[PDB]
Amino acid sequence: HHVGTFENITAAPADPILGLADLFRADERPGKVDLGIGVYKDETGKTPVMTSVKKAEQYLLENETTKTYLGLDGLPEFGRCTQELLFGKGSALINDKRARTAQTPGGSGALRVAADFLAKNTSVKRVWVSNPSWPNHKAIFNSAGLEVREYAYYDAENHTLDFDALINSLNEAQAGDVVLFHGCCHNPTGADPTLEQWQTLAQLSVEKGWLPLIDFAYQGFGRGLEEDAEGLRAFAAMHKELIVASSYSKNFGLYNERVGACTLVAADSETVDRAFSQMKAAIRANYSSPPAHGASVVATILSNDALRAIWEQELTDMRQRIQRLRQLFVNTLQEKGANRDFSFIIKQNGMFSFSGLTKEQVLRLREEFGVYAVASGRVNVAGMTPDNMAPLCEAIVAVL
Amino acid sequence: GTFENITAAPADPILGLADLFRADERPGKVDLGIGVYKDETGKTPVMTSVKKAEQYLLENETTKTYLGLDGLPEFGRCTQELLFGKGSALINDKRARTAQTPGGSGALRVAADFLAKNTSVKRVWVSNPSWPNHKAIFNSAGLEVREYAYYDAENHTLDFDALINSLNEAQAGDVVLFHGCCHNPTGADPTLEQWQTLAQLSVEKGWLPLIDFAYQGFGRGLEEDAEGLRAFAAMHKELIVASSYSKNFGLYNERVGACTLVAADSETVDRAFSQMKAAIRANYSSPPAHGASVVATILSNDALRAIWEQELTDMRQRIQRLRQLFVNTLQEKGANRDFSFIIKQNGMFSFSGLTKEQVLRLREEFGVYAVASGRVNVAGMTPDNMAPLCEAIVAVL
């Protein structure tokens, strides 16, 4: 007799998200509202395929002649388009060939590739992430054997990015550590550094010698494509080295196609080429080449003036809707008699903010009113509509 | 600088040979070093069934919202039917769980990370000759890779005696990796009787079989190619299967594969699979939908499935015909030795039996390109290039 290889495995803990989705599905109240969602939804409650994406897919279907493998870094045009979004057309960084980009399976894949590349090829032992954290960061970096530490970031009770605390906590970050920043639309708080703050952080990273990693999954959801990249570009202007993990899941609505990129920046082209050769090795040890369809869609859109214009308008419409809903949420809370100020909501960027509700209040909201947020109090503003706003605000006022 | 001292990775010999071939100005050049299927016209087309499925999806799809870590459920069900057989006791007993993954490559990395983090597995045994990417994948997860004896190069045979003797060193708790059919690069596969012997040995010694199954349908047919896998599954222990649909659906760049865990019972495999999902969450999270949706659409539609099965049959039969033509033509051109082994081998790949010096001469002198190891891809052969190709081979013997 031999013990089974799987015999001693203890089950992973049940995912609370899926469980809460369960209760929500079973709720027979016609007025139930789900603010716990992690994707964009439109005014009708759907997560549609963008029209620009449908048009690109039709083109690909008619024109693709082979699905033979591409290289470990994926589609070259996709890489070029990615670097232009990150750094700007005509960027000196691009002119000097200081950046190399690998297409990856989502921003998640890009983070994993970065982690594996760092663990195998550098002396990095530690990655610093914000509090509150995006939970998947720890799992990804830990899997590569990297310790994850948190820096101070959001002051929840005052609904403020506590920049002094951020700077102070980072004094503990040593030269050679990685510090991860969300490039725009911080998830889950929506609280972003101002440009002046980004410039301060960029200067600090040079002085202290840590490697910035920019997680950039919401370009276009904040203030605009160029605006949302201003922080990233401040780092790029000051630093010899940088890593960017990009996602097109949200801004192209391509979630399930797994479209992202890992971009390395080094002091010069010789150095970035050497480093990138080892990034390719990390990819070869993982999934090898990245999935073509979603990247082909992105390249098809970005490289075509007409399709690009359609896509930019679609993204603008999403961004403006979120901005309008943030204002509407605040107005409606005031109108329904909220006992306190929610102005911070207008100061925050992207789909997510902390409502400021306690765990007990979130529970009461679900039980008593059928309004579902996550335990942390995070809400997704895209789940709000003119149709459900007054009911959800009356419910919130009731639990305060 | 964090990157200043990084040492450049070695040159990829594959890309380097492809560069050489591309620059070769000789019109009679022949590329047998390719790693994908090519048709009679030298193309790797999209299968007709796949184009049709893609059109269905474009019409039908209403969202690209995330799926779960294991991907598309119907894809997993279709996968298990291909692996184990529809209506099989194994499926009825809910003994298997499948995660859709980015290619067979991704399935292998997911399996490796799962094993390293959740089991006492320290070592993975692979065949000599090896498929080069296995070592990098398993080493990346912290697992040692050891080689077992497999192919007798001089006699062009699977050396089963050496194989069995090699594996006596495999310890309870180790993983032993087998190619399910169409061994790459040799095309030399165990007979059913040999698979059964290997399955019995795994139970006796307590090692975990991992079946790399990337060529189902390229050997003798779908069911036939799964017989070896099913012989292991019949043992009622534990198994892992890393599937690929890259080759048999021509979906290479879409990254469509699966990692399937099997255990003695449903409760056990459920516990294991929960931790496999954790390994996926720490990697790329959910898998790429497009290629898996294509596979599921084809396999669950009578009209499309028939089109696909005929296409795959046509490819399999073309390869078989070319193997025979190759052997016949070598004999006619006066080869000084027997190449009958080529007919006894399955799939696109065989070792030609040429030495490294001979391979070099073949490329330099005659513009015929094989892999340095002497591996050739039969699908690169055609009725038109066959005579010149064989004349060149005879010339370097």
mmCIF file of C-alpha atoms in Angstrom, chain A residues 1-13 18 38-39 47-49 53-54 57-70 72 105-106 108-109 112 116-118 121-124 136 139-141 143 176-177 209-211 240-243 247 249-250 253-258 264-267 271-272 274-275 277-278 280-282 284-294, chain B residues 1-10 12 15 35-36 44-46 50-51 54-55 57-67 102-103 105-106 109 113-115 117-121 133 136-138 140 172-174 202-208 238-240 244 246-247 250-255 261-263 268-272 274-275 278-279 281-291:
data_model
loop_
_atom_site.group_PDB
_atom_site.id
_atom_site.type_symbol
_atom_site.label_atom_id
_atom_site.label_comp_id
_atom_site.label_asym_id
_atom_site.label_seq_id
_atom_site.Cartn_x
_atom_site.Cartn_y
_atom_site.Cartn_z
ATOM 1 C CA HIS A 1 0.000 0.000 0.000
ATOM 2 C CA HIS A 2 1.120 3.550 -0.801
ATOM 3 C CA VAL A 3 -0.463 6.748 0.500
ATOM 4 C CA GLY A 4 -2.161 8.627 -2.305
ATOM 5 C CA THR A 5 -0.317 11.685 -3.587
ATOM 6 C CA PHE A 6 -3.412 13.834 -2.863
ATOM 7 C CA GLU A 7 -4.452 12.142 0.379
ATOM 8 C CA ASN A 8 -3.163 14.780 2.797
ATOM 9 C CA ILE A 9 -4.380 17.818 0.910
ATOM 10 C CA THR A 10 -6.708 20.037 2.892
ATOM 11 C CA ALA A 11 -9.325 21.882 0.867
ATOM 12 C CA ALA A 12 -8.669 25.526 0.074
ATOM 13 C CA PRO A 13 -11.019 27.840 1.983
ATOM 14 C CA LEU A 18 -18.764 33.184 -4.899
ATOM 15 C CA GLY A 38 -15.756 43.431 -10.147
ATOM 16 C CA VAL A 39 -16.353 44.289 -13.800
ATOM 17 C CA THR A 47 -21.236 43.684 -19.518
ATOM 18 C CA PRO A 48 -21.469 43.822 -23.285
ATOM 19 C CA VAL A 49 -18.871 43.204 -25.928
ATOM 20 C CA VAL A 53 -14.356 44.714 -30.468
ATOM 21 C CA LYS A 54 -17.135 43.019 -32.449
ATOM 22 C CA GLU A 57 -13.400 40.203 -34.408
ATOM 23 C CA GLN A 58 -15.306 40.180 -37.714
ATOM 24 C CA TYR A 59 -12.210 41.511 -39.441
ATOM 25 C CA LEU A 60 -9.968 38.874 -37.840
ATOM 26 C CA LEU A 61 -12.374 36.069 -38.732
ATOM 27 C CA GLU A 62 -12.321 37.136 -42.356
ATOM 28 C CA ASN A 63 -8.585 37.817 -42.593
ATOM 29 C CA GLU A 64 -6.633 35.452 -40.326
ATOM 30 C CA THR A 65 -4.938 32.733 -42.429
ATOM 31 C CA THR A 66 -3.145 30.738 -39.706
ATOM 32 C CA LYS A 67 -3.056 30.247 -35.940
ATOM 33 C CA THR A 68 0.583 29.156 -35.948
ATOM 34 C CA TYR A 69 2.604 30.123 -32.876
ATOM 35 C CA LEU A 70 3.999 33.593 -32.402
ATOM 36 C CA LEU A 72 7.144 34.326 -26.467
ATOM 37 C CA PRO A 105 -2.445 36.510 -20.348
ATOM 38 C CA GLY A 106 -4.010 39.511 -18.641
ATOM 39 C CA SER A 108 -2.449 39.038 -13.819
ATOM 40 C CA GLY A 109 -0.177 37.098 -16.134
ATOM 41 C CA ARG A 112 3.318 36.731 -12.478
ATOM 42 C CA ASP A 116 9.209 35.124 -11.797
ATOM 43 C CA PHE A 117 11.658 37.284 -13.769
ATOM 44 C CA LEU A 118 12.612 39.255 -10.638
ATOM 45 C CA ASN A 121 17.343 37.162 -12.176
ATOM 46 C CA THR A 122 17.674 39.885 -9.542
ATOM 47 C CA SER A 123 18.309 40.327 -5.844
ATOM 48 C CA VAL A 124 14.751 41.528 -5.206
ATOM 49 C CA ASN A 136 -4.276 38.835 -5.706
ATOM 50 C CA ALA A 139 -0.629 35.349 -3.923
ATOM 51 C CA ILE A 140 1.222 36.109 -7.164
ATOM 52 C CA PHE A 141 4.404 37.509 -5.618
ATOM 53 C CA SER A 143 4.296 32.166 -5.462
ATOM 54 C CA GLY A 176 16.619 46.819 -4.331
ATOM 55 C CA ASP A 177 13.042 46.310 -3.098
ATOM 56 C CA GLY A 209 16.906 53.065 -5.102
ATOM 57 C CA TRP A 210 13.780 50.984 -5.201
ATOM 58 C CA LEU A 211 12.332 49.567 -8.406
ATOM 59 C CA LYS A 240 16.505 54.329 -15.445
ATOM 60 C CA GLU A 241 14.442 51.208 -14.650
ATOM 61 C CA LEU A 242 10.744 50.400 -14.349
ATOM 62 C CA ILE A 243 8.265 47.552 -14.825
ATOM 63 C CA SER A 247 -4.273 45.137 -18.650
ATOM 64 C CA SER A 249 -9.456 43.539 -19.672
ATOM 65 C CA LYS A 250 -11.368 46.552 -18.498
ATOM 66 C CA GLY A 253 -14.029 44.770 -22.109
ATOM 67 C CA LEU A 254 -11.898 41.757 -22.986
ATOM 68 C CA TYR A 255 -11.811 40.189 -19.483
ATOM 69 C CA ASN A 256 -12.038 36.533 -20.463
ATOM 70 C CA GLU A 257 -9.628 36.728 -23.411
ATOM 71 C CA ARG A 258 -6.680 37.452 -21.050
ATOM 72 C CA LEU A 264 10.487 46.371 -18.938
ATOM 73 C CA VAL A 265 12.316 49.677 -19.023
ATOM 74 C CA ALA A 266 16.087 49.928 -18.518
ATOM 75 C CA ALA A 267 18.703 52.693 -18.721
ATOM 76 C CA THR A 271 20.491 46.546 -20.895
ATOM 77 C CA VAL A 272 16.778 46.188 -21.563
ATOM 78 C CA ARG A 274 19.582 41.526 -21.948
ATOM 79 C CA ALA A 275 16.975 41.692 -19.202
ATOM 80 C CA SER A 277 15.920 37.777 -22.828
ATOM 81 C CA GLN A 278 15.508 36.458 -19.272
ATOM 82 C CA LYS A 280 11.319 35.494 -22.168
ATOM 83 C CA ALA A 281 12.879 32.566 -20.300
ATOM 84 C CA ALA A 282 10.393 33.098 -17.453
ATOM 85 C CA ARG A 284 8.930 29.795 -21.601
ATOM 86 C CA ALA A 285 8.895 28.098 -18.185
ATOM 87 C CA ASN A 286 5.235 29.064 -17.739
ATOM 88 C CA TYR A 287 2.621 29.122 -20.564
ATOM 89 C CA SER A 288 5.018 29.870 -23.429
ATOM 90 C CA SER A 289 3.388 32.100 -26.039
ATOM 91 C CA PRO A 290 0.439 34.294 -25.003
ATOM 92 C CA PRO A 291 -3.139 33.961 -26.268
ATOM 93 C CA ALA A 292 -3.503 35.616 -29.651
ATOM 94 C CA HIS A 293 -7.184 36.513 -29.995
ATOM 95 C CA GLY A 294 -7.552 39.347 -27.496
ATOM 96 C CA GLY B 1 20.694 49.233 -11.440
ATOM 97 C CA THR B 2 18.436 46.257 -10.739
ATOM 98 C CA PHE B 3 18.909 44.947 -14.309
ATOM 99 C CA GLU B 4 22.482 46.104 -14.959
ATOM 100 C CA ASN B 5 24.116 42.793 -14.032
ATOM 101 C CA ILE B 6 21.616 40.413 -15.620
ATOM 102 C CA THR B 7 23.269 37.824 -17.844
ATOM 103 C CA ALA B 8 21.721 37.387 -21.284
ATOM 104 C CA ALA B 9 19.859 34.116 -21.839
ATOM 105 C CA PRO B 10 21.466 31.776 -24.383
ATOM 106 C CA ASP B 12 17.283 29.961 -28.904
ATOM 107 C CA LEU B 15 14.979 30.733 -33.899
ATOM 108 C CA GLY B 35 7.321 21.996 -34.947
ATOM 109 C CA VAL B 36 3.790 22.476 -36.248
ATOM 110 C CA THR B 44 -0.629 25.878 -41.453
ATOM 111 C CA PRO B 45 -4.237 26.844 -42.209
ATOM 112 C CA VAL B 46 -7.106 27.473 -39.840
ATOM 113 C CA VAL B 50 -12.618 26.277 -36.409
ATOM 114 C CA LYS B 51 -13.533 29.081 -38.829
ATOM 115 C CA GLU B 54 -15.527 31.259 -34.667
ATOM 116 C CA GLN B 55 -18.415 32.605 -36.736
ATOM 117 C CA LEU B 57 -19.202 32.621 -31.400
ATOM 118 C CA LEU B 58 -19.095 36.034 -33.013
ATOM 119 C CA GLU B 59 -22.833 35.810 -33.612
ATOM 120 C CA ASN B 60 -23.748 34.372 -30.234
ATOM 121 C CA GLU B 61 -21.439 36.030 -27.706
ATOM 122 C CA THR B 62 -23.041 38.689 -25.544
ATOM 123 C CA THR B 63 -20.259 39.272 -23.012
ATOM 124 C CA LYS B 64 -16.599 38.629 -22.324
ATOM 125 C CA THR B 65 -16.982 38.794 -18.562
ATOM 126 C CA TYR B 66 -14.637 36.569 -16.520
ATOM 127 C CA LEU B 67 -15.231 32.883 -16.070
ATOM 128 C CA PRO B 102 -3.262 28.331 -21.686
ATOM 129 C CA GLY B 103 -2.036 25.415 -23.809
ATOM 130 C CA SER B 105 2.396 24.195 -21.660
ATOM 131 C CA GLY B 106 0.261 26.082 -19.167
ATOM 132 C CA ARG B 109 3.187 24.565 -15.275
ATOM 133 C CA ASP B 113 3.095 24.454 -9.166
ATOM 134 C CA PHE B 114 0.196 22.430 -7.718
ATOM 135 C CA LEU B 115 2.507 19.461 -6.985
ATOM 136 C CA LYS B 117 3.029 23.448 -3.127
ATOM 137 C CA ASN B 118 0.629 20.707 -2.078
ATOM 138 C CA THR B 119 2.380 17.345 -2.237
ATOM 139 C CA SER B 120 5.636 15.692 -1.283
ATOM 140 C CA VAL B 121 6.663 15.326 -4.945
ATOM 141 C CA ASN B 133 10.513 22.568 -22.382
ATOM 142 C CA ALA B 136 12.359 24.387 -17.648
ATOM 143 C CA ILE B 137 8.734 24.104 -16.517
ATOM 144 C CA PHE B 138 9.324 21.622 -13.709
ATOM 145 C CA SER B 140 10.738 26.581 -12.329
ATOM 146 C CA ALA B 172 7.044 6.362 -4.275
ATOM 147 C CA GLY B 173 6.029 9.999 -4.347
ATOM 148 C CA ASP B 174 7.911 10.782 -7.567
ATOM 149 C CA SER B 202 3.040 2.586 -11.060
ATOM 150 C CA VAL B 203 0.703 0.882 -8.584
ATOM 151 C CA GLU B 204 3.433 -1.451 -7.358
ATOM 152 C CA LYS B 205 5.991 1.318 -6.816
ATOM 153 C CA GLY B 206 3.634 4.163 -5.889
ATOM 154 C CA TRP B 207 4.712 6.859 -8.316
ATOM 155 C CA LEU B 208 2.260 9.339 -9.847
ATOM 156 C CA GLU B 238 -4.229 9.152 -8.976
ATOM 157 C CA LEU B 239 -3.255 10.608 -12.340
ATOM 158 C CA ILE B 240 -2.643 13.985 -13.934
ATOM 159 C CA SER B 244 -3.304 20.300 -25.630
ATOM 160 C CA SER B 246 -2.922 23.227 -30.235
ATOM 161 C CA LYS B 247 -2.164 20.561 -32.793
ATOM 162 C CA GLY B 250 -4.742 23.839 -35.238
ATOM 163 C CA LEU B 251 -5.276 26.365 -32.432
ATOM 164 C CA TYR B 252 -1.587 26.875 -31.523
ATOM 165 C CA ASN B 253 -1.604 30.599 -30.826
ATOM 166 C CA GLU B 254 -4.909 30.610 -28.948
ATOM 167 C CA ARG B 255 -3.317 28.619 -26.075
ATOM 168 C CA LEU B 261 -6.653 15.633 -12.012
ATOM 169 C CA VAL B 262 -7.932 12.130 -11.331
ATOM 170 C CA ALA B 263 -8.219 10.481 -7.937
ATOM 171 C CA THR B 268 -10.410 13.427 -2.876
ATOM 172 C CA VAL B 269 -10.144 15.012 -6.310
ATOM 173 C CA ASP B 270 -12.338 17.898 -5.135
ATOM 174 C CA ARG B 271 -9.907 18.696 -2.290
ATOM 175 C CA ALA B 272 -6.947 18.490 -4.663
ATOM 176 C CA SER B 274 -9.391 23.367 -4.864
ATOM 177 C CA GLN B 275 -5.638 23.773 -4.383
ATOM 178 C CA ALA B 278 -5.163 28.341 -5.953
ATOM 179 C CA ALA B 279 -2.081 27.677 -8.115
ATOM 180 C CA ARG B 281 -5.026 32.195 -9.086
ATOM 181 C CA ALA B 282 -1.368 32.873 -8.291
ATOM 182 C CA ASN B 283 -0.441 32.635 -11.993
ATOM 183 C CA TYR B 284 -2.657 34.011 -14.803
ATOM 184 C CA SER B 285 -6.020 33.626 -13.056
ATOM 185 C CA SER B 286 -8.684 32.644 -15.565
ATOM 186 C CA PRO B 287 -7.713 31.005 -18.910
ATOM 187 C CA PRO B 288 -8.165 32.531 -22.394
ATOM 188 C CA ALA B 289 -11.737 31.944 -23.524
ATOM 189 C CA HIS B 290 -11.600 32.117 -27.317
ATOM 190 C CA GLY B 291 -9.828 28.863 -28.149
#
